[PDB]
Design a protein around this ligand. Structure first.
Ligand SMILES: CC(C)Nc1cc(Nc2ncncc2F)ncc1C(=O)NC[C@@H](F)C(C)(C)O
Length: 286
């Protein structure tokens, strides 16, 4: 179901993997592997070139992305078009997302305008629908974060990066993920869909506050610490509502915060399941 590209055709797609930013006319869109813009015929694409975790581990992540994408198609999941596995190079080719990542739109990277409260609610609902589809199909994402929530031209939320996804509580010896979003049990090696819920709660805090989960030049560096300040009544969520919005209403904001607080319950069995998260987010805009 996916087109097998040769690494050489992807060179003709990405203008030989041009590393200048797309904001100045280049092909680079983001990094951490690097994602490049390209054209396949008249289709705009995103080409993720994977970079070194052992070679067999990176290869397992590449094969896992293909396996999950082959089985999961949904309007709130990114769509894989093809891949390249020839040689020591590994590429994944996706439909291009005109509004990039939720992380980048919350920070207004490259001068994009701040997202309205109304749009933020729709994005949170779309992301919850995508996670629900994955959990309904017995898949645990393991890397839910705002950098992995992409936005199409209509700002439809699309869950990405299925390289760490697992079929569905079990344990692992290789702890993987993004620490600022991870549930305490995920950090100690447990594999459970309840961890995706906790990470989604961190995304909801990023949506409310416009603050990234981690910022090295911020005090406190972790957004979960800010949550601790609100739990210990040292501050309120009103003190942290993103000032870059003009349409946030306290009722709707408090309702999303209450969803986020439930997602962030200390004990995993007290967290709501994804169907309940969807219900609560739908009630918030009802
Ligand atoms: C790498 C991330 C941060 N960015 C993208 C990712 C992308 N698609 C995917 N990238 C990686 N995995 C799956 C995909 F669908 N399409 C596109 C982008 C991307 O930058 N679009 C442009 C917008 F962000 C703009 C024009 C506001 O700058």
């Amino acid at each position: 179901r996916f087109h097998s590209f040769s690494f050489y055709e992807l060179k003709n797609v990405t203008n030989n993997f041009d590393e200048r930013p797309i904001s100045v006319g280049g092909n680079k869109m983001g990094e951490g592997g690097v994602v490049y813009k390209g054209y396949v015929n008249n289709t705009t694409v995103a080409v993720k070139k994977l970079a070194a975790i052992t070679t067999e581990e990176l290869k397992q992540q590449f094969d896992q992305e293909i396996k999950v994408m082959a089985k999961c198609q949904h309007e709130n999941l990114v769509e894989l078009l093809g891949f390249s596995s020839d040689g020591d190079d590994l590429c994944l080719v996706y439909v291009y997302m005109p509004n990039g990542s939720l992380l980048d739109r919350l920070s207004c990277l490259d001068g994009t305008p701040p997202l309205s409260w109304h749009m933020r609610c729709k994005i949170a609902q779309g992301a919850a629908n995508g996670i629900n589809f994955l959990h309904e199909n017995h898949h645990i994402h393991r890397d839910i974060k705002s950098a992995n929530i992409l936005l199409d031209e209509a700002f439809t939320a699309k869950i990405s990066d299925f390289g760490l996804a697992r079929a569905s509580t079990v344990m692992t010896s290789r702890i993987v993920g993004t620490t600022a979003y991870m549930a305490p049990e995920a950090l100690r090696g447990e594999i459970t869909p309840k961890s995706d819920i906790y990470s989604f709660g961190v995304v909801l805090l990023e949506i409310i506050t416009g603050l990234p989960a981690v910022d090295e030049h911020r005090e406190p560096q972790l957004l979960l610490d800010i949550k601790e300040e609100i739990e210990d009544e040292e501050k309120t969520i009103e003190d942290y509502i993103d000032k870059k919005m003009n349409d946030a209403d306290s009722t709707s904001v408090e309702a999303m915060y209450s969803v986020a607080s439930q997602c962030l319950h200390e004990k995993k069995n007290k967290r709501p399941d994804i169907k309940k998260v969807q219900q609560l987010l739908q009630e918030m805009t009802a």
